[model samples]
Target: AKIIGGFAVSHTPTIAFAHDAPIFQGFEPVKQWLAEQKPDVTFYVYNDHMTSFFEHYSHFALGVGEEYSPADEGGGQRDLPPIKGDPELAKHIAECLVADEFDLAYWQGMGLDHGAFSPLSVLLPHEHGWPCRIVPLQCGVLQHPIPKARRFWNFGRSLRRAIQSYPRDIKVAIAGTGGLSHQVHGERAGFNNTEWDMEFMERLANDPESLLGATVTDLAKKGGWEGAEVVMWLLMRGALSPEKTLHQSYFLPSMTAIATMLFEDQGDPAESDEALRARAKRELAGVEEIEGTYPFTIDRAVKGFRINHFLHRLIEPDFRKRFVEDPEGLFAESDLTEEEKSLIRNRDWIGMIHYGVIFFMLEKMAAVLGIGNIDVYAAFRGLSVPEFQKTRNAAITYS
Candidate 1:
């Protein structure tokens, strides 16, 4: 895969609700730019508005599912088709990032909030579905102690690594969505720092490293508190060569300082995607020689990470207590599909293995429910405890 270019734009909720607002017209160039690029997959970076992610949020999250539905932010769901995702590339990216030492949370069927949908509606103008596929990367910008500004920039470097190394002939675009300058709360309600916004944009294109020195707190002082999320733009900038800015614009009809800038990489290339693929293949070349033995590759890892994460939480005392007390409540809030929920609910031991869970993670859940290893083995072979025991010298068992 090749990173063709990237876009940095604000994702204020007002853009969706008040579509007729004059400020929204500023997105014209952005829409035009996207239409021209026609990227196969867009690596979208945005934050949640306490909708999809909540109090117990991870600092960084990646969506590894094939599709994502729009969240209902107190209103009815946006009548938009599920956004398509390129899961294979997404899996590859997830694996690459993990190997690069990034601790990221993985979401399977999570809904995208206005942070994404708001801007996307106008940018893509979709009636049935979006024009291209997406791989959503959610930043933990809603809470305090968010990753430092420099961390986002470094993340962009790793993101470039993950994308450039993907073994596919596809053009990818980066969309880093956030604020310019606007304060929605406190005595300083409805704040907009036009001077700082322009200065920030200038520094973003020319002296990005200078922009990195300011803390999010400092950003709040110059921009609004929420506007500090412009660091996300640094994420987009870091992915591409700093040589070109194809387009840039700013608008502020209401509260937010909605801005858009397009950047195209000028041959700041990495290792060939094919090279990484070949390297990966050589690492586990002969694993197929063993029948019924599955190697936990990126595909299976992405497919089952959600369930595995849920199961692994059985080790946490509070999670175990909550799960035991009200599995339904937990299920209701989770991103699991109905089929996956059923598999866990029914204790389908073998079924789970087929669905991508490693056997040991299943054991953690089994231990939670007082199920022994032998019992799971018996379930695997479609036999009762006694019948399976007949095959062994003795009735060996352990949780």
Candidate 2:
């Protein structure tokens, strides 16, 4: 399997809503050109509208199902046809992504909100059925703790490898859709910067390496605050053949500085083994000396995820009962190692925290065990309950 090309385009809600109407009559050329390529699958890259993912739940959701429905931006569902989804490919990619150390959350219920429909509608207008099966790489960008650029690149690199792993001979493309200067609300409702947008496009097409080092904060400042969504474009850029430019376009419409471009590969150059090792080393460099910080580093997250996952699950009521009644079975069911399962079983308050398990998570576990905060605190200091209480400004009265 090989990528036919890669693309990045802006996706404002309004543009998506009126793509077929007069508001964006100017988009026809780009749309027509994109439709001509006829890729068998597109790895649709965009974020949710605070709809599919919200406060309590947000993860790297891979759209895995036979079909995807479209959501109304604000009105009712879009009149467009349902999107065809490639579940097998999605599952294959998700499995290997874990092997490559990317923590992806699979989702079967993503109806096409503007995050998805916006980009596709811009290309495959509702007048006809969509032309290709979609493998949506729905990222979490609307909120923070966004993955770093290196992680995004690694994800894209991992996806490239997965695409190659499939036994089918098909053309796939990556479409990163969203952002190019404009914040739609707040005191800076109309913030727009054509200059920065232009520069972003230039570097995105010509010097992808230079663009890789940029901090998200820097992009948000020059682009608008909402323009932070631009970070998603890095996904498409990361999947392309290096140092090559195919086709490009940029336009400032009513609200956003819209743009789209292309990248093609002769055959997957295939991420070389040395480069993979070098990247892995670079990603994990210089962490031991950093003082008073866990970095919650990707390394720590990957190594401790099973323990953290098991601990996080304690939040649910039945999970607590399940753990308490058959603790051994629960630990056995979890992907936790012997040492990790032992640490939790021992109720090693401090030890669990040291293993990159967050305080909140441990607190959840403690709560499940009917242990108060003060009890955990006393255990942490290896002191008597009253002794630990005496050290505090306000004693642990639980009042």
Candidate 3:
């Protein structure tokens, strides 16, 4: 069976908030996990706020074409880079859903809202770049008479089949983002039910079928008005085998009961199944015991790298010129440490880039250090500078 994965988070950021620290804390772990897993492709199933499809375009849908999608979070557009959807996989999933009598509307060139990008930006960090292609499946839960709980579950099951039966050997994971019993609208805003949330967490692993049987009204009454988001969990649970093991679980009452669990079939031989299962359970248990492990060090490093890179671009030309004219002087201008200066002076372009030095600036520095752009570019691309430059036309034409 193809490796199937699912992720969930509250829609506070997706629907209303944008670029806040609290939401980042809630989203960091899931993003870290996605980076570690490095799935060839991801099927992100989320809701679409008015930002993407307005009241007129309200309905369950899937994007089944390769296109650039932007986040319309009401600030004109997020600073995020464009998201590239995997049309091939999306089209297949659409066909399978239709064949199963689940007629899903197909959208091409549809802009995604926070329901899609808020959590994603945390996970993929477009500044450094996204690690995998995405196939977006959007559910219209905000609208009434949404896909029945059972239908969502069955849709996940069919999605697994569609992914596994694909002709290619690409690894794919599905993320169902949004909700764990909290309402952001109406007088019922600021809702939190720890007891029901804990119960939902328990049932999500050991007894999701029981949760799937719950009526929308029942879920809302029990989990909170926003408990409606729990329906997305059914899609995730349905993707795994009945005997799959649960890896990690977590809950933060103020935000959402943030949990990270790993699920694998009952039997697997590539590695010691029992050891891996034990490790999975232990990882979650440890996370629960530790107050802060979700936003691991790696997550912070990635975030730091992105922020630094963004700032570094502001001085790109100055750094390039300095590097080309005087490598030692360029290092002096940078606040980088002595060791960093030594590394840069040694023509370690790759090392400098990893240490937060911009690559283009390093190329100019290399030239000043007498290392030559040819050698530097050759180290990165296995081609000489002139050979690579030859591919481009040097002549400029006036319009």
Candidate 4:
């Protein structure tokens, strides 16, 4: 796999609703640039605007599903097709990045809000479905303790390494979407800084390192708090070769200042091929050194997707009813291997975990079966429920 090109653009929802406005016309050239790139897969970078994650959120997340539907904000769902995703490529990147110590979280079924769909609607408009597959990387910038600007820049380098090391032969493009200037909050409402926006873009192209010193707070003071999203561009910028600027444009519509820049990677990557492979290899290097343990890694998740997905569906009432009423019938509907059928059919709790089904999913299955947590714990330790209870302070039975 190879990274052919990159795109940095704002993702304000205004462009989607008010496409007829003259300022929005500035985005038409982006469509042409994307078509010219002819990328098979796009590594889309954007933040979740409190739609998918809240309270408990990851610093970084990647969507590894086959498709992603549009999230309905309070009003209604937007008029756009679901994004087609490349699961194989996404899984590969997840595995590589985790081993490379990014602590990235990859999910299967997540909805995309305006932060994602808004820009995608114009960049690659489609009636039935999108033209190319997407690998959505959602940054956690909405909450406090978000990743630093320099961290995003480093992630881009790791991302580049992940893409280049992929065994498949495909042309990949990077889209880092968000901010230029303008704030949409109290006191600073309707704030716009054209001078700062222009200087930021110029510094980004010529010397991204120069912008590294500024904190997200610093960005907010000048460009507004939400404008701090411009840090996402560093991830895209980090993925590219240095000192290569292809095309750039900017427009301030209403609240957010919209900007787009396109660049193609020029020379060899900063790290050597062998070194990149070595770093990824060490991501989970010593985990296997332990006995009777599997960490539920991306590789295991990929190998056991069908079984995990099957068990995951137990959350649905009708599916759980069917499983309880006709276990064999439900098993026949799935492409489960004979061994997997035996594991579920016999309720081999420990066996399921050993077979790569995540412990959390098994907990859900156990709840459906009316099995208590203690029962499963006893089975895990190769003991009867009473024997395990004797080792504990209290013999509690709860799922």
Candidate 5:
């Protein structure tokens, strides 16, 4: 598989955002360790700190953005230069990940919180332009039904499968950043368990699958409520085959059981990525059963932006005035294609909808023209307004 290996580091925002880090030891004895291994891309697996996601509503999102600045969470944006990302790989992974029925949210404009930046900044360093690019995979960890650990495990497997299919010659690494052991809230806020943390790290290093049957209540009882986020480690551990702990270290920096480790890959994969893709394709086949369904694809969205912008602005009084006063002037001001302009000028309601002017925006335009939603719907449906109203709860006269 393309995943050469993976690294795990504790993600404590407080630790990452610190203007002055307290103190820490080295590699090998700490030297030549971080510098020895370098990764071209990291499948950065992190969670939103309630700053970007809530449970179920928007749990899983892949960063399809080209660059990301640190999120603004009260202390103002950090002076660090915006971090770059690899969108091409991100897109490929999204396609493969979704094709595998992982149900992902591919986001174009996403920000990074310390849950992400803290560990990554430390792991990847702060050099100019940043050395490593990432495919940000976020999971739900805040509330109930917080995406299953099993799903996250499957997520890791599917990710490696996607990475294996990638057509590139580069070292790919996965970074799962989250808990070690410590509570961040309540009377037990500063509570920790070095014994549990050591055992936890040991199990992760050797037999990760043993922890698969773990429950939230079980984890919370042992490692505090939020400390249950240790599942992120399980995800990273699952992505790679169980291997001898190549490099390992542990630290109790403040309230959390901070730790870092690296593992090696066995080169031989149990199943080929191509085979998984084919299998996923076979199982979830024939999804596009209906013909003539609106695609609203990225390409279509790119082409439709101009007309959509022109039409959606009708809600603004000043824009509506300018549009009503000089329709041509407004059209000229917009970057709409000639065909797009014709569709709008001709008031081809259905044509505009097909061309990606949203039905809602068409209703907005209709309202501006003293037309009703019923009229717009009727015209688009190849029916008379009276007939369309007959289909509705026919109430009042046109407003």
Candidate 6:
């Protein structure tokens, strides 16, 4: 609700690794700011690397119900202790997101990737702990067909809904991490567009509307591949009113132009239906309706619910063992109804596929049930189950 604190620090490992040393100029200021503001929770928006999440599961994710998350740095999990996530705030945000018609992937099993932990580790450096709670929103801008600019803007609106709806009267800050400008790969690897970077800082503070009209293609052309990731910052900007005052800002061009700015909304809280409609209409301009929109259809909702329920099993050793021991029994034990169980066991591939549950897990399940992949495919298409596996010779028959 308020910009109680503002922090600016470099995210590069060269700087972050030496965070505790006196040479790391920004450390003291950040530490002082944290002590002063003492915010209860932070809504952090960061991008993921291939460390914790693979290219296979690429999608915008929100860690809605996690308690603590540890970073997966290369060889094994980072020795740095797990960071705590505020479940209450996280759940509230997820519910508000659904109500506002935003299709969000809720993750329960995700580990903290460098995109999140690298900055946090420096911000709240301690051998034993961190002071406040964290609500993480992971953006999938790295991959193609990412959420459009307007979608991100609307996401911020939804985030405001979630934050305002929070029952507790605690101070909350929205922190956006990542680029000002700098390329990481190819011949243009060390590229730093200082002119555009400075312009970005100004526009981000005073004229975000200029960005609304810019395409992702345009961003890449101007800022380089890595710079496109800065769109996540717009999500942070969207939460505050246009008239919100920009408290402070800093930009450095070494790695990413590490910058931090604070904002406070100035206008009235309530909005008329007409005003809302006009805003929506404006955001939808130029963008094709069917192509980019994330519709919260009944089928999609059901799939999300099912996937969340299925993923929950992974967290419990006993439940995971039971699933491996008896697949049907595991399905029966699930809170999903008998119809859902039938759909899974019958390898209703089309039904499952429509829900975006494509993965090796489903493939393995189908194989174990003696229903060949073709039968699963037919079921998903609402066609008659084709008989095939009955004739195939098996190394060892389950029956």
lDDT of 5: 0.72
Cα error of candidate 4 at position 97, Å: 3.0
Mark the regions of model 1 whose C-alpha exceeds 4 Å error after superposition: 20-22, 269-298, 301-352, 357-373, 381-384, 387-399
C-alpha local distance difference test of each model: 0.82, 0.73, 0.62, 0.82, 0.72, 0.63
Give the range where candidate 4 is weakest over 10 consecutive residues by summed lDDT.
19-28
Regions of model 6 farther than 4 Å from truth:
1-11, 20-23, 27-29, 56-59, 244-254, 264-268, 271-399
Per-residue error for 157 in candidate 5, Å, reads 1.6
* Alpha-carbon deviation at 101 in model 5, angstroms: 3.0
Please report how far candidate 3 places residue 81 from its true position, in Å.
Answer: 1.0
Candidate 2 has a TM-score of 0.65
TM-score of 6: 0.65
Writing each residue's lDDT as its tens digit, candidate 5 over 1-399 gives 377677776778866656342233412422233455567787887788877664334567777666778887677776566777777677667667777777877665446888887765555557576767777878777777776767677877777777777777887877787887878889988878778888888888777777878888878878887888989888887778656566666677578777766776765356675675565455435746855456554434434666776788898999999877889998887767999889988989989878877677788888898888778778877899778778777445452
Worst 10 residues of 5 by lDDT: 22-31
TM-score ranking from best candidate downward: 1, 4, 5, 6, 2, 3
Per-residue accuracy of model 2 over 122-144 as CA lDDT, tens digit each: 67755667788898877887677
Q: What C-alpha lDDT does candidate 1 achieve relative to the native structure?
A: 0.82
Name the lDDT of candidate 2: 0.73
- Local error of candidate 3 at 248, Å? 4.8
- TM per model? 0.81, 0.65, 0.61, 0.80, 0.72, 0.65
Candidate 1 matches the true fold with a TM-score of 0.81
Tell me how many clashing residue pairs each candidate has.
Answer: 0, 0, 2, 1, 4, 1
